[PDB]
């Protein structure tokens, strides 16, 4: 996995990789690894998926009730604490490593959060196997007051470093763009470099090939009338 | 405890299982009945670690005794079957598991037909023509797969029994002092007391 | 301390009557109107913002509140009260449906939980009954458009349209007159305002009264896009402006 | 030791042009020893269909329990559950068990009876939701049954050439594994008729 | 303290009777009429809204029938929300029973939990009985088809033809002088709705004012089927019957 | 006649031991008064020591409930102090939880359920108090939001409490019908706490020094109260002109 | 009258009512006197019979080598009140390995008796007792009343005609508190104490209860033909 | 980790680094662990960063409910709730802090909290991987009632030796200054410390 | 009616009517006295002698809590006790987490919020008891009067119990003699002029002076008993002024 997160001159940008995998074996190659928080505050997640999968989808069902309660559009950092103090009491046992990003009326945010329950603030972070490829594209492209797409594009640029170089990441680019005042962009399979290419050869069976036992009607449909 | 063996005939359930109790070093008895009638047309035999073997089993019997006082009326094989089956996947999860394996033989007087059911600790339940746990299986099973019939009479069933046994006495490293079988059918359930 | 009372507050009479049920009724007869409209196309709730002083800022008052994004809720009778109830009904549609089958609950259901939760405090230890009677308008894809209304009993009934509270009775018999199953949404906002000037005294604007909808899904009112599947909330609360627009056409 | 395989079985299932088809082998084993050669891993509650592999235990468990579940469903909602929703409902019972979970793998597969479009979903024993467009597969011989899959599997399959596609994906699968095979069914589904198939095979 | 306020639900009067139990029957008394008919081909399920309006959405409506398995119904008599509670404890029991056995819980099993369950508040815990009578509309391979009823005390009966909630003197009386035991379903079914004609406070008896459901074997071959009539079917079979 | 001792309902409908504790609200005699300027929000409260051996300087109604958030309170001084605590609590508890600090808005939205609970629970009684909460939201920006016994709370544009609260809510009622504005348009907070101070003065028809009267002043970021020499310099700048 | 309900309950004029009929209880129980000297304590008790065939109720009970009291009202409630000063003198000398100091265990009984005069279910204590101690301030002697009031005295009685006792003790104060390094003459002041309170009866030898503590005396009960010496 | 507070003249002065490590990959090369629980009262983090954040929050708590009902807390209330939980949760936890504050009436004062949750009053303390590197200039190099910008130095000079010697330390220098005057944030960057 | 009988129910005045039966438990008990001097607090109470047989000085009244605060209080002493028992408890969890010993205010509203809790259910009685306590902390001395109600201001003076109106009456005429204030030396003789004075109110029995003292020079702001030549020296001081 290859998650990146990089702040801009008016908000913030995700990315994530498409690639999950059970062992050395791709389970699916077009996972979707950027979550939803709330409409406007999104964040991925490295390392046990079913974690990260379900600490996003907790803190964000009491995010909106949160949100309902005090007339207020959610918060990053109400996310952040919420997570945190979750995490660090089941002591690194929710094996969730995120990167949560967002815009809300206090401005635009970036953090990272860890399973024992830490956090830190950046500009630029990357999580995941492929994140020390990503965070070399990082370090050497990046700088203060970026544009929209002059972060989308280093964002990107990032999470290929990791599809071509991590073996734990590849076939495409997820991009989520949060600008101030505006709607949430969300742009799955940003990038596609990975298309399988045409193969040699037909697989399609002469009807009759396989051999067969027993036929017979399965009732679907509920007990009938007269 | 060791051998506990199972085979449906065409009109009843036939079970054998050892006599031996083993504690160690000693053979402290040979003459143990390995069984407990749950229902006037269901058996139950099992084998496992010592204590909770007889401890479940009884529990088990109490269960399905307080049911039929209840209701007035006796539960399928099937139905027995599942409860005790949900006991055992409840206590693989517990503090301490009932670490026993069991058979359900049993006559459906509704279908009027046997009916033989094989559970493990874990709480893996298979219906099966013949069945057993342990490694009685890895003895018998070859044997039974060449010389079954699902038309079976109770006689013929029992010489193919005799023969699995045989088998065993011959192959196997511990000496289970003989086996007590008993036939479950329309009738009820009775003891073979000549085997 | 400890919670010592134990036992039932509400209990049947001689003459099978529940007091404690019928005086909760009785609070909600004297509370302001509100009432429920269901269209072809749509649902509409409206009632009447009854300002306790002109100091006080009534827009920070919601007597109309959303429960899910497709469920609105209004009431009469005791505002406290129906600001717990919301409260609980938003949350216990995330606790006993959308945390378990990652979709909000269908009216219905919502409506039944509500309907739950307003019973236990007709029959467990040391409390009183609610003393609201909710109208619940929403929409979900296999029942379509709905509109129930919950009393404090916990009874609840679907309406294609109803009255509840101060003038039940004469907007009732007025919604009789003017409902037919052909109805498009803004006729059914037509009649509601129609319905609502009856009841109302003093002024009667965009910010004396209380109105939100169940219809269309507003793609704008969501804060994200790029999920095709996805296509915003149904529930929209009309604004001051909005309301003015149609009292001309009125 | 490791409960994934003591037991042993493979599901596996796949989309086509208005139609899924969910498959799996028959066997039910302790180990070496083979034990049950109709031990269907296969169950649908309505037009939801679920395979699940794994601890054979937890399989009937979990088979219990969403009848349990999705009988409650329809008793309250007046409709049969989709394959969307029971998704997310076996994602939430798994999860639930976090820190002592049901070794399992699941499957699901059915038709929107609304939408009419074909769905197939897989889980790992914890829970995480792998949607794939093209296919699923699970239990001892998930490797053979990703290089069968991905090297047979082309998309918008009719039905009838639906079924000789996974049917070859499991079989030669299963010959590959020894805790896999003895019997194997495929389902084959449409939106308004299910016709399942009992295959011959070799029973070693 | 607290015992000042205490009314004491679960005590005996001098007579030897449950105050709270009788004044719930009071209570129940003033419900819409609910028959339950058992034929030798199945059962029947009739019941009378109360007093409803023209604005109120029948179709999607449900005050009196409810499904607690496909082979086992109830019809109320009392308290909707009261019965709701009950009815979702019930529906859990029997996936219970299901989920333990593998085999669908017996009629009179079900209604036994679910009466115990009434006796309970009636005899600890302080609290109000649940103003609800029930009859339980069921079959299983055991007995066949059965008619039960249960009410706040938590006494349960069974009954070849049994009516509760209002005007049940006169329901009963009706039904014991034109039933008999080798009648069948569309004879039951008939037999309930001249039932609710004559003995109903309203001035005519419309579709508009009902709910019916029948239990047939009228399910192709060897099974069972639950029908919960739709609001044209009752108006069609009040036309077939001739009251409309 | 026991619906009239616990919070249960009477036969119209109504919660007596609610009523009740509306009547204790006035128990102390004292009158508060709350406006918004366009950076702050004053809150002023009649001082009353009517005993000679009392400590003047630890008589008060006023409350600093966070660095944001302060509470004025109409009613007796237990229920009071009650409320201040919990409110403090509950303000501190937010922050923790939800990592910024709690609205002014959301904390008499989470008193007034409490307090509502009270009017459903029969063994807790009804708290005998009215809560009048002040700051300067980051959000809404000046707020006043007032709780009540019945658990009854609203946003105001300025408000009164005490016995002669009608006389009060009056006088403000027609200044903001001359101005046609929600709030004092005033630069510094000095001005508007003038300003609050003198329509008291022309509502209750009294004069005060500089020890009749408690003020409370809300800015951006912090709450405070005004000294009796902070009140005195207002007083004389008031009647300087 | 319409506030001696239960023990929660104030009356119009701040009394409370079930604390003050627990109090009548004691004036019902037989006398029991208590008087000290700069070296020992005594404690005298007339105990009560049934009838005839009955046995005296026991009126002393030993609470440690160095403490204990004499009862009078509901016999039950001592039980559990001098069970509660057994376990807390324990407590002081296993834990502390120190002798538990009388006032410090009359400061413990109030407190354990007031908590069943401000909480709805309980009730008052129905008994009031006498503590007599010898610990490293020299001779105790305590009152306790079920109100919870405790009170350190040189003498004192309680029980039915206790007033006798008690004017007898005030006259006596100046002559019994010299008393020291004599306990057989201690003893006779307190026989003479309590003969002031009888009335029709006389002190047998199975009537008599006496008890005593002091500077090198372990607390010890006198009864039966122990206390004829003293008749 | 390189971390301290120094005791001057006009008050208190935390210094650290900005380097936090998973093994030998630095996951943070711009951390702030200068942590505010309250207005002039700071702190100094090392060991499990997810403990000392959970600490420090709970610590921010209860201070800023004291200061509600009691007013400003003293730095050594400060430090007795950090022990609080360090002590009782010795078990669960690896932090090790030092907290710092200005009073009025104390001035400036230092408190270390070591793992074990033992509390140490100092005129300066020094903790983290680093500060092994330093405790012998340090105990040279300390003076007490020395001037803000001769603190500055001596806080700077020492960082910039653990950072040269420690491997987990490393990055800017970050300082906070807490006297009656207020609170001021300094930094320092590598070009100007390497060359000391 | 019925309004009385039931603790935490407003009457339709908005009164509770329970309290004000418990204050008059605590009027009809003996004299309690507190004065607030230059750098401390003084407090003192009237011990009525019901017989001879009481031994003098051991029946002890007042009560520190920490070593910095003294209580003293009327009416129903068991109550006293409980609250003085509860206030240990808070003073002692104060300092455990804070270090530092329980300030006055804060300690003020430990007991106070605890008071008040007892006016919330009918499971529970009221105190039957005004409670006068201070001391000194790091901002100086406190004196405190805490009635049934939880009801508690700051004091330079304060009195309860049977005789409080005469006691008021003196406490005010120091308050207006002294604007500079009075030493603790001052305000232990005064303590005892003012006791003396107020047992006009409990003239048939005769009674026994108690005094104790908190102050910054004189205690070290540590509680203390006033005792041997001290208190005798307050005592003649008294009897001199009643003559
Ligand atoms: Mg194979
Ligand atoms: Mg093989
Ligand atoms: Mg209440
Ligand atoms: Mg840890
Ligand atoms: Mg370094």
């Not at chain 4, 083979?34 to 088979?63: C, P, R, W």
């Amino acid at each position: 996995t290859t998650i990146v997160g990089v702040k801009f001159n008016n908000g913030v940008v995700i990315a994530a990789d498409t690639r999950s995998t059970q062992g050395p074996i791709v389970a699916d190659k077009n996972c979707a690894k950027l979550h939803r928080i709330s409409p406007k505050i999104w964040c991925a997640g490295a390392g046990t998926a079913a974690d990260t999968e379900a600490v996003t989808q907790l803190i964000g069902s009491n995010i909106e009730l949160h949100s309902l309660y005090t007339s207020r559009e959610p918060r990053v950092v109400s996310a952040l604490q919420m997570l945190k103090q979750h995490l660090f009491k089941y002591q690194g046992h929710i094996g969730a490593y995120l990167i949560v990003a967002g815009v809300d009326p206090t401005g635009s945010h970036l953090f990272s959060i860890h399973a024992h329950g830490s956090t830190d603030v950046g500009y630029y972070l990357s999580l995941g196997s492929g994140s020390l490829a990503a965070m070399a594209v990082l370090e050497s492209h990046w700088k203060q007051d970026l544009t929209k797409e002059e972060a989308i594009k280093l964002a990107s640029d990032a999470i290929q470093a990791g599809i071509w170089n991590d073996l734990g990441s590849g076939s495409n680019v997820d991009v989520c763009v949060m600008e101030i005042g505006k709607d949430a962009e969300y742009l799955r399979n940003y990038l596609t470099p990975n298309v399988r290419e045409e193969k040699q050869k037909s697989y399609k069976f002469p009807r009759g090939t396989t051999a067969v036992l027993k036929e017979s009607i399965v009732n679907i449909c509920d007990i009938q009338e007269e | 405890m060791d051998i506990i063996l199972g085979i449906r005939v065409q009109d009843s359930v036939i079970l054998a299982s050892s006599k031996a109790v083993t504690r160690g070093i000693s053979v402290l008895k040979d003459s143990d009945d390995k069984t407990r009638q749950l229902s006037p047309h269901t058996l139950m035999s099992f084998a496992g670690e010592a204590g909770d073997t007889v401890q479940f089993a009884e529990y088990i019997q109490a269960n399905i005794q307080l049911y039929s006082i209840r209701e007035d009326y006796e539960l399928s094989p099937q139905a027995v079957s599942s409860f005790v089956r949900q006991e055992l996947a409840k206590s693989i999860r517990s503090r301490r598991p009932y670490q026993v394996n069991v058979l359900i033989g049993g006559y459906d007087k509704k279908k009027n037909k046997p009916e033989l059911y094989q559970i493990d600790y874990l709480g893996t339940k298979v219906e099966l023509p013949y069945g057993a746990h342990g490694y009685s299986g890895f003895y018998t099973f070859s044997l039974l797969d060449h010389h079954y019939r699902p038309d079976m009479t109770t006689e013929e069933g029992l010489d193919l029994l005799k023969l699995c046994v045989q088998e065993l006495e011959k192959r196997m490293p511990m000496d289970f002092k003989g086996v007590i079988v008993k036939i479950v059918d329309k009738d009820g359930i009775r003891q073979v007391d000549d085997f | 301390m400890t919670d010592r009372y134990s036992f039932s507050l509400t209990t049947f009479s001689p003459s099978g009557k529940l007091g404690q049920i019928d005086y909760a009724l009785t609070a909600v007869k004297q509370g302001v109107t509100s009432l429920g409209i269901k269209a072809t196309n749509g649902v509409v709730i409206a009632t009447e913002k009854k300002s306790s002083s002109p100091l006080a800022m009534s827009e920070t008052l919601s007597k109309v509140s959303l429960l899910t994004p497709d469920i609105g809720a209004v009431y009469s009778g005791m505002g406290p009260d129906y600001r717990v109830l919301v409260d609980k009904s938003r949350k216990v549609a995330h606790t006993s449906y959308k945390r378990i089958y990652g979709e909000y609950p269908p009216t219905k259901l919502l409506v039944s939980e509500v309907a739950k939760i307003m019973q236990e405090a007709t029959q467990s230890g040391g409390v009183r009954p609610f003393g609201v009677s909710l109208l619940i308008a929403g929409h979900d894809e296999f029942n379509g458009f709905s509109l129930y209304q919950v009393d404090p009993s916990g009874s609840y009934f679907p309406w294609k349209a109803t009255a509840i509270g101060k003038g039940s009775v004469a907007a009732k018999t007025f919604l009789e007159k003017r409902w037919n199953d052909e109805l498009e949404l803004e006729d059914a906002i037509h009649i509601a305002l129609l319905t609502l000037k009856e009841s109302v005294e003093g002024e009667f604007n965009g910010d004396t009264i209380e109105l939100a909808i169940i219809g269309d899904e507003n793609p704008d009112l969501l804060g994200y896009t790029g999920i095709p599947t996805d296509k915003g909330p149904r529930f929209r609360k009309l604004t001051s402006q909005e309301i003015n627009d149609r009292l001309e056409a009125l | 030791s490791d409960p994934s395989s003591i037991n042993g079985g493979i599901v596996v299932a796949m989309t086509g042009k208005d139609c899924v088809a969910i498959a799996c082998d028959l066997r039910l084993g302790s180990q070496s020893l083979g034990v049950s050669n109709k031990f269907e891993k296969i169950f649908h509650y309505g037009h939801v269909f679920l395979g699940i592999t794994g601890l054979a235990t937890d399989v009937t468990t979990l088979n219990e329990m969403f009848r349990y579940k999705t009988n409650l469903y329809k008793l309250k909602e007046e409709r049969a559950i989709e394959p969307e929703t029971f998704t997310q409902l076996v994602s939430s019972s798994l999860y639930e068990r976090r820190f002592g979970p049901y070794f399992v793998g699941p499957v699901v597969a059915g038709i929107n009876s609304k939408s009419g479009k074909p769905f197939i979903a897989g889980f790992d024993l914890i829970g995480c939701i792998d949607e794939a467009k093209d296919f699923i597969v699970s239990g001892t011989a998930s490797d053979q049954l990703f290089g069968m899959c991905e090297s047979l599997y082309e998309p918008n399959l009719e039905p009838e050439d639906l079924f000789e596609t996974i049917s070859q994906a499991l079989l030669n699968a299963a010959d590959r594994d020894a805790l896999s095979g003895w019997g194997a069914v495929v389902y084959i589904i449409k939106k308004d008729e299910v016709v399942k198939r009992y295959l011959k095979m070799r029973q070693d | 303290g607290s015992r000042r306020y205490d009314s004491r639900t679960t005590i005996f009067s001098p007579e030897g009777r449950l105050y709270q139990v009788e004044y719930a029957l009071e209570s129940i008394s003033h419900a819409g009429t609910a028959i339950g008919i058992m034929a030798s081909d199945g059962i029947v399920l009739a019941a009378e809204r109360k007093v409803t309006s023209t604005l109120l959405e029948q179709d999607t409506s449900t005050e009196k029938l409810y499904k607690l398995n496909d082979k086992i119904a109830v019809a109320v008599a009392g308290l909707t929300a009261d019965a709701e509670i009950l009815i979702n404890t019930a529906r859990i029991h029997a996936q219970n029973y299901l989920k333990t056995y593998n085999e669908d819980i017996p009629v009179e099993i079900l209604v036994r939990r679910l009466s115990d369950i009434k006796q309970g508040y009636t005899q600890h815990g302080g609290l109000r009985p649940f103003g609800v009578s029930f009859i339980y509309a069921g079959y299983d391979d055991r007995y066949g088809y059965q008619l039960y009823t249960s009410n706040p005390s938590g006494n349960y009966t069974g009954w070849k033809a049994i009516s509760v909630g209002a005007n049940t003197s006169a329901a009963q009386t009706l039904l014991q002088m034109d039933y008999k035991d080798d009648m069948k379903v569309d004879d039951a079914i008939e037999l309930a709705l001249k039932t609710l004609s004559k003995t109903t406070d309203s001035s005519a008896l419309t579709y508009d004012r009902l709910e019916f459901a029948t239990i047939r074997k009228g399910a192709n071959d060897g099974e069972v089927y639950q029908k919960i009539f739709k609001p044209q079917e009752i108006k069609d079979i009040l036309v077939k019957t001739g009251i409309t | 006649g026991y619906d009239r001792h616990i919070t249960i309902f009477s036969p119209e409908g109504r919660l007596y031991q609610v009523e009740y504790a509306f009547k204790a609200t006035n128990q102390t005699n004292i009158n508060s008064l709350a406006v918004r300027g366009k950076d702050c929000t004053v809150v002023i409260s009649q001082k009353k020591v009517p005993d000679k051996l009392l400590d003047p300087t630890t008589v008060s109604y006023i409350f600093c409930i966070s660095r944001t958030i302060g509470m004025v309170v109409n009613g007796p001084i237990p229920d009071a102090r009650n409320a201040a605590l919990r409110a403090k609590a509950e303000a501190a508890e937010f922050r923790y939880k939800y990592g910024y600090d709690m609205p002014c808005d959301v904390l008499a939205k989470r008193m007034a359920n409490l307090s509502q609970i009270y009017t459903q629970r029969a063994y807790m009684r009804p708290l005998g108090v009215i809560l009048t909460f002040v700051s300067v939201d980051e959000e809404l920006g000046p707020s006043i939001y007032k709780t009540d016994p019945a658990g009854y709370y609203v946003g105001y544009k300025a408000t009164a409490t005490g016995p002669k609260q009608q006389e009060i809510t009056t006088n403000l009622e027609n200044h903001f019908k001359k101005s046609k504005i929600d709030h004092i348009n005033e630069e510094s907070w000095e001005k508007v706490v003038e300003f609050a101070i003198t329509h008291m003065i022309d509502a209750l028809g009294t004069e005060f020094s500089k020890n009749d009267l408690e003020v409370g002043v809300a800015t951006k970021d912090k709450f405070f109260t005004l000294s009796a020499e902070n009140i005195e310099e207002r007083l004389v700048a008031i009647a300087e002109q | 009258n319409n506030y001696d309900g239960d023990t929660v309950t104030f009356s119009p004029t701040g009394r409370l009512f079930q604390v003050e009929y627990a109090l009548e209880a004691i004036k019902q129980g037989s006398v029991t006197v208590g008087l000290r000297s700069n070296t020992h304590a005594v404690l005298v008790a007339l105990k009560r019979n049934a009838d005839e065939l009955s046995s005296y109720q026991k009126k002393i009970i030993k609470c440690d080598e160095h403490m204990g009291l004499s009862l009078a009202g509901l016999a039950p409630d001592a039980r559990v009140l001098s069970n509660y000063l057994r376990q807390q003198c324990n407590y002081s000398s296993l834990v502390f390995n120190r002798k538990l100091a009388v006032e410090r265990a009359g400061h413990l009984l109030c407190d354990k008796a007031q908590k069943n005069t401000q909480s709805y279910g309980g009730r008052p204590y129905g008994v009031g007792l006498l503590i007599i101690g010898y610990d490293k301030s020299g001779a105790h002697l305590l009152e306790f009343q079920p109100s919870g009031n405790v009170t350190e005295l040189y003498g004192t009685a309680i029980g039915a005609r206790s007033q006798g006792a008690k004017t007898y003790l005030e006259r006596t104060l100046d002559t019994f508190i010299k008393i020291d390094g004599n306990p057989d003459e201690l003893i006779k002041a307190g026989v003479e104490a309590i003969s002031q309170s009888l009335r029709d009866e006389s002190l047998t030898v199975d009537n008599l209860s006496i008890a005593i503590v002091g500077k090198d005396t372990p607390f010890t009960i006198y009864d039966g033909e122990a206390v004829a010496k003293y008749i | 980790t390189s971390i301290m507070a120094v005791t001057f003249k006009d008050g208190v002065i935390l210094g650290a680094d900005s380097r936090t490590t998973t093994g030998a990959y630095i996951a943070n090369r711009v951390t702030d662990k200068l942590t505010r629980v309250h207005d002039k009262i700071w702190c100094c983090r090392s060991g499990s960063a997810a403990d000392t954040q959970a600490i420090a929050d709970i610590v921010q708590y209860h201070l800023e409910l004291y200061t509600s009902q009691y007013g400003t807390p003293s730095t050594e209330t400060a430090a007795s709730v950090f022990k609080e939980l360090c002590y009782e949760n010795k078990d669960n936890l690896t932090a090790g802090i030092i907290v710092a504050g200005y009073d009025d009436k104390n001035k400036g004062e230092v408190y270390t909290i070591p793992l074990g949750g033992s509390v140490h009053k100092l005129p300066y303390a020094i903790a983290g991987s680093g500060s092994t590197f330093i405790y012998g200039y340090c105990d040279k190099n300390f003076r007490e009632n020395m001037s803000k910008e001769e603190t500055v130095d001596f806080i700077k000079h020492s960082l910039s030796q653990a950072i040269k010697w420690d491997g987990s330390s490393g990055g800017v220098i970050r300082m906070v200054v807490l006297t009656a005057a207020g609170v001021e944030r300094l930094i320092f960057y590598p070009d100007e410390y390497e060359q000391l | 009616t019925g309004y009385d009988l039931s603790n935490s129910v407003f009457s339709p005045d908005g009164r509770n009517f329970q309290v004000e039966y418990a204050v008059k438990a605590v009027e009809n008990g003996t004299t309690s006295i507190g004065i607030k001097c230059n750098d401390g607090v003084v407090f003192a109470v009237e011990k009525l002698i019901t017989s001879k047989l009481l031994v003098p000085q051991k029946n002890v009244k007042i009560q520190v809590v920490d070593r910095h605060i003294g209580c003293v209080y009327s009416g129903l002493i068991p109550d006293g006790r409980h609250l003085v028992n509860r206030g240990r408890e808070e003073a002692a969890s104060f300092k455990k987490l804070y270090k530092t010993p329980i300030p006055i205010p804060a300690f003020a509203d430990r007991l106070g919020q605890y008071v008040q809790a007892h006016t919330l259910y009918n499971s529970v009685r009221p105190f039957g008891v005004s409670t006068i306590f201070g001391g000194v902390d790091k901002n100086g001395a406190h004196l405190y009067m805490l009635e049934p109600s939880g009801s508690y201001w700051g004091y330079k003076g304060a009195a309860t119990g049977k005789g409080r109106q005469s006691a008021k009456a003196e406490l005010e005429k120091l308050v207006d003699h002294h604007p500079e204030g009075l030493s603790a030396r001052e305000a232990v003789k005064q303590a005892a002029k003012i006791i003396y004075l107020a047992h006009e109110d409990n003239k048939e029995k005769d009674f026994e002076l108690e005094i104790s003292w908190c102050s910054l020079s004189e205690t070290n702001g540590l509680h203390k008993f006033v005792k041997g030549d001290l208190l005798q020296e307050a005592i003649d001081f008294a009897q001199k002024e009643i003559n």
